[PDB]
């Protein structure tokens, strides 16, 4: 048993909705320090790490650390019914379902049966990112979108004072450039000229759920994975780790 | 002949659009006291009563009480072309069509042939409602919508200080609760604990055309019909009478 | 080579998008006085004339007058990615593609291969328009739309103090009337009572890309073509010449 409460059900729906983009099924670790979740897409190309500490919850009462299995699509169809000014209550009895409550103009309660989830325990090799990039969400989603007009894959090129996302076609070619003079670029650190490429289908599902002025941080290296971070209520962290196109 | 005028064509389109949800064909009684319409859905599960008195019309000139037949879909495709600041003019000559005019930035006139409509004359048995409920439209449409995630039918349960719309599934279950402490509940009177169930497909079409902050009144009894009211310009009344699931 | 710049990429996308409605392929004449384009729909029923003078461009640098061929759909899929506050740069090297750049939160560059376009040189017979009409875009698009409920074709009837767009059916009939008392009518000059008819499918594609409060001027004559003008930044001119239904 636990009772966990989040003010603004529509925001929380958005996290879940984002993770649901690549995840079908996930195991949620619920501790007193917080809630965490680690899953992979079906193709095992994307890793997802979600970390929701106590501090972003209005009431966090975990008596008996616990892991629960959740079908991510049925969870997101339910959360999508919560409205922006609703209070969300995730609560668990001695049974095997998640109580999901929206409290706003009314008390609306759903019961979502908890499932049995394959808890693969695997993690990380070398993480020698030689590049760090912070940009506005709308650049990144624009970039994924423009490149999709042209190609399968998008190449990330980080140099000097330049970050470049480039895609090329059989006649067309697109290229998005960000220098520190640009409004869309919040930060750029480059230990070494770095080139790498990623599947646009994957990138696209990663950034669907990303907001207007959201700040996203990318870390990557030459022909190695792409790490994409963005923060939730300043203390939540959603991380994607994307395999490169080789 | 008659000339009837309504300021705000888009509002009137909305009534008609709502009634059109369950009605294909209808007969409109046009008198000097007002306009009224009584029809049933094809399955004869829902009764619709619409009452539009003189007082909600800017000009109401009925010389020769008259009943006219209208195809409800062709009427609603036409009314859907009227814009919010348009003045609506429903006018009839000695011919067999309805003149529908929108007057705004321009005079736009449609002619809708009047049809021959089966005027079944039937009405009401016992109406021993042991429960009355007034709630915000957005609760009701949220409620119909959440339950549709789970089930065929939605059970209405009115007790003490509680109103409850509940649906259950084969694994999932949803429940919407309203007490007078709640913002969404405007009024609750319960002569006796009352339980009854309704088809969600029917409920859904009943509340599609219902507005944000609209106030809806429900009256029902145990295993008997559901009456749903809401008002139009404070003096119009649209009523649904819904057969229970038995 | 040339460099041409337009502040507000989304506006320019809208011109192009409008012309693209009837045009698949077009040749763009680029001179020092401005940019112009003349094309016809596949059915050779509509003529399109587009004129974009230097004065509507923030930077206009044409060294070597030049004509370029453009696939209109690939150009409009690209321009549709420019956002409202973007600066648009159309630039050309000694190669055979158009550089399309959006400069805003970032530098986004597309390369659109220039094509080979059938440059038919044909133009105009008698232009004895006996009627001139200026109206709000929302009337015209409403009018095309209401008539589509009823018929293949829309008849334009200009008299005294009256302009009338009328369509009739096999039971239904629609009629839109504009007199100088009306808000939607900005101007009306009638040398002679004028009647003519046009295909609604064509009209509809002509006015899709037309704005809320846009002012459109129609000139036509009895059973002769319809000329439709509207202006861009007060000095751009997009013209349609539509064959009548005979």
Swiss-Prot record, chains A, B, C:
MF-aspect GO terms: DNA binding; DNA polymerase processivity factor activity
InterPro entries for the chain: DNA_clamp_sf, Pr_cel_nuc_antig, Pr_cel_nuc_antig_C, Pr_cel_nuc_antig_CS, Pr_cel_nuc_antig_N
PANTHER family to which the protein is assigned, alphabetical: PROLIFERATING CELL NUCLEAR ANTIGEN (PTHR11352:SF0)
Alphabetical UniProt keywords: DNA replication, DNA-binding
Function: Sliding clamp subunit that acts as a moving platform for DNA processing. Responsible for tethering the catalytic subunit of DNA polymerase and other proteins to DNA during high-speed replication.
Family: Belongs to the PCNA family.
Keyword Nucleus applies: no
NCBIfam families xrefs: pcna, PRK01115.1-2, PRK01115.1-4
Pfam families in the cross-refs: PCNA_C (PF02747), PCNA_N (PF00705)
SUPFAM superfamilies the UniProt entry points to: DNA clamp
Gene Ontology BP annotations: leading strand elongation; regulation of DNA replication
The organism's taxonomic lineage, starting at the top: Archaea, Methanobacteriati, Methanobacteriota, Thermococci, Thermococcales
CDD domains: PCNA (cd00577)
Name of the featured protein: DNA polymerase sliding clamp
Disulfide bonds, paired cysteine numbers: none
SUBUNIT field: Homotrimer. The subunits circularize to form a toroid; DNA passes through its center. Replication factor C (RFC) is required to load the toroid on the DNA.
Keyword DNA-binding: yes
Stored PROSITE patterns: PCNA_1 (PS01251)
